[PDB]
Amino acid sequence: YRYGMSRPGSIADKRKNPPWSRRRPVVVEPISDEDWHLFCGDMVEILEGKDAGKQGKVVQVVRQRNWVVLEGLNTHYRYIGRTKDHRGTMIASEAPLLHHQVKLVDPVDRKPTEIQWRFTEAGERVRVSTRSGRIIPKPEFPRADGIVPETWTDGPKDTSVEDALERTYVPRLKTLEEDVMEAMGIQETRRFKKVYWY
């Protein structure tokens, strides 16, 4: 299965990789989790490509193909809304960039500085530039659903914030089933006879 820009399992992916397809597999150089340094929202400079030398923010990363996608960069032109009545409207369509085709940007100085992974006091891994050493903080990305947690307003069937955070568990030598009995006063005096497990 060849990974493509289309999300795996999508209709385009199914056409891209039909069940009978046995194309010559494309080999992607394995990159370790520690080795990988590109994440969505990271400002990076394109080493080579259509928009080489233009710094952009990552929006999608297909780690399987070592592909980093920059919105509005490495862009070719395609037609949206092509129909019988109308020819269609040209729009910007991005193309994937391989990991070696981009480099991270030092915030203070905008350059494609090579980086080395190192931990911090908190222990969180942070990329450090090999030259002009500096901490590149993890970029902030909005939630996929578009919901800002604080701005969210409770809808029907949604517990209020305080209710979820309230702690009522009291450590005791009783299970949920036993505790439920005490609260609701379930009492059973009948007893199963001896059972030979085997």
Partner: protein, 125 residues
Amino acid sequence: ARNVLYPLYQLGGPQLRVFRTNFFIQLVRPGTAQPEDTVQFRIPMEMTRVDLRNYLEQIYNVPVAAVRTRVQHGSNRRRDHKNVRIKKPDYKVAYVQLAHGQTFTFPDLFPSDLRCPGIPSWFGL
């Protein structure tokens, strides 16, 4: 509760109590013509009609007068690209008649210029 082990009963043994229920049921609009008080339900195949009667009476506080249940065979004719038969999951349809004179009705869910052709309109020339 489904896909769980129930205690074996012996003479004088404790009454069987299910404190947490894994049975999940779906109310379905009648495919066939049924009395209005009658309500159809799609229920797990391991559930008994008594369990449904207890389930509705206790969890949902619904009075039940009569219950009729049928098992619909899932078609296995369908085959995949490999010619392997695909079996539709079998489901149990339960016809429940309400008591206390209650009646049920399924709610209505989901209520260039022609004179100058071949020259793009962009051209002013």
